[PDB]
Amino acid sequence: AIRFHPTNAALVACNAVVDLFDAGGSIEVYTGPQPNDPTVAVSTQTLLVTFAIPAPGYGPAELVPGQNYVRAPGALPAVAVPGASGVAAWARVKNNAGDVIFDGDVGTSASSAFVRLSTTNLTAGVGVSVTASEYRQPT
Amino acid sequence: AIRFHPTNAALVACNAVVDLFDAGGSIEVYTGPQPNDPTVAVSTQTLLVTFAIPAPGYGPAELVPGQNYVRAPGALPAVAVPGASGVAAWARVKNNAGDVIFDGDVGTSASSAFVRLSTTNLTAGVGVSVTASEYRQPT
Amino acid sequence: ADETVGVHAVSHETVIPSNMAGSIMVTDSSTLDGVLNVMVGTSVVGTVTITDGAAVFASSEFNLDPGQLVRIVSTSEGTFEYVGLTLVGHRQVVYVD
Amino acid sequence: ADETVGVHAVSHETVIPSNMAGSIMVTDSSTLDGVLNVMVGTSVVGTVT
16 A cells, blocks of 8 residues: 655655664563563563674665665674573664664574574573674565 | 564654655545556556645654554645546655655555545546545554 | 585586576575676686675676586675575587487 | 575576476485475465475
8 A cells, every 4th residue: 555665755764763773772682472562571581692782783774776675784793792591582672772672583594583593592601693684664 | 573662663753754744745646557666657547636735744643552553643635626537546645845755556445545435436526525544654 | 705605517518698698696685795706617707796685797608518517606705594596508409319 | 493495596487386296305204294385585385294
């Protein structure tokens, strides 16, 4: 019902939200079950590892030829030492302001999750380098 | 399966695009076939009726309880009488600045199309009322 | 970087068009960028450039003979889930009895 | 679980037979039990048990 015009709308929408990370932030990994929504507080989820969002981490959004969307490249986080060993079931992201931005999903590289794990579980203290990530406005 | 925070995230984007009509705008209704995307110009379709969005076309945006999406009330363009007959199939949106914004298909009152009508059959000289229409965005 | 990802031995004489026109490659990574080196023995014969999924082929017409093996050599590290590459070659239809 | 084992780039327009007839699979593992899914673009297109 909607085909967003890339330059007129999709790029604007991409920049508006992704630019919230220009100051950076952090990425938090927690065991399951995943909270139903960002408004559900942490009650029993166990943290596994943390990461720092480089400042800036996104923007400017740029067009993707031959695809039905417009993308915005993402920054690369440092290799952070994981905490206690645990099988991640979800994760949370925070801007430098320490504000919840959205909820994510966990899955192996074969899955579509932005949590692009090489392996199902992460051990304790084994620094893991994030492959890469980005956000793309659907169109 | 990304889920956004309704407060910090959802309404920001909702405002980021809807406010573009605060200067007003316009809409177009065309027969079939539908061009592939907004960046493809109209070739042979026949215009039937045009509407103008009173300023502001949108804003402010609020939350929708009991939903996974946010919305924003929009202005109500006055009635327009078609100059030509036919059956509307496709519509294009035109801001007062003249730039395209996006496009959407038409549909019946039971449809989810960007345009909802009791009858998709139209005759010149018979206008109709734009009772209401609002934007939405899943979170 | 510098990984002999794939190879193949040529059994029947074959001809490839200029610039490998008709060949095609695909990969999920919408942003991955790199350049692939297509060698023949130790002689450069073709290369392909990648820019956010944008594949561009560049080479001239050349022959292939039995006894020859085509070699594919990468340039730098790459990140993705899958990469698909395929070349088009013209072969005569001589029957084998 | 949830791992890609193969992909291929289609060159010339091609047709696929119904039920993937003509296709065949063989393996040594006489006890192997699992299911495969065929994906093109985004959505699955076929499955093999």
